[PDB]
């Protein structure tokens, strides 16, 4: 932690983006995929459903993003690192643009997993849920 002062702010490199809440991204020389903590995107992938109202959008905007920012950094919590399945959870940010919280702040996404503690960051994602709910975006529609 050091002087930090928190958490710590990496930068990174975009490879390849999946959908609303998963990128592959390449930290510190390597490549490897992120998830986006304290946050669930429309199901886009496994038949276990279909395309989730919302999803393929959902998808269509943290993928550019993404794409025009000409940097990023990820931002890990206070938890673990990376969950089952090899994909760190961290609330990317792109232009210091909060891609879970932009995403949320659209209605694109919903607030899921905000686990103890590694979730030093729920507030205010939760503001922004209320607000694309109290107008009524995509989802909330
Ligand atoms: C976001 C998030 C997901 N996960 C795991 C729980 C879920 O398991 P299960 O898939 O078996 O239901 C899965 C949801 O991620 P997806 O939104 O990619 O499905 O990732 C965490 O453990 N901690 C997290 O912060
Ligand atoms: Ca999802």
Redesign the pocket.
């Known amino acids: 932690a050091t002087s930090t002062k928190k958490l710590h702010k990496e930068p990174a490199t975009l490879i390849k983006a999946i959908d609303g809440?998963?990128v592959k991204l390449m930290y510190k020389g390597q490549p490897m995929t992120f998830?986006?903590?304290?946050?669930?995107?429309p199901e886009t992938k496994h038949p276990k459903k279909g395309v989730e109202k919302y999803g393929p959008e959902a998808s269509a905007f943290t993928k550019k993003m993404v794409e025009n920012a000409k940097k990023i950094e990820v931002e890990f919590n206070k938890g673990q690192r990376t969950?089952?399945?090899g994909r760190g959870?961290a609330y990317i940010y792109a232009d210091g643009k909060m891609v879970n919280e932009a995403l949320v702040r659209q209605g694109l996404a919903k607030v899921?997993?905000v686990?103890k503690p590694?979730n030093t960051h729920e507030q205010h994602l939760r503001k922004s849920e209320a607000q694309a709910k109290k107008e009524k975006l995509n989802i909330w529609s």
């Open positions: 809440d998963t998830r986006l903590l304290l946050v669930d995107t969950d089952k399945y959870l899921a997993y686990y590694n």
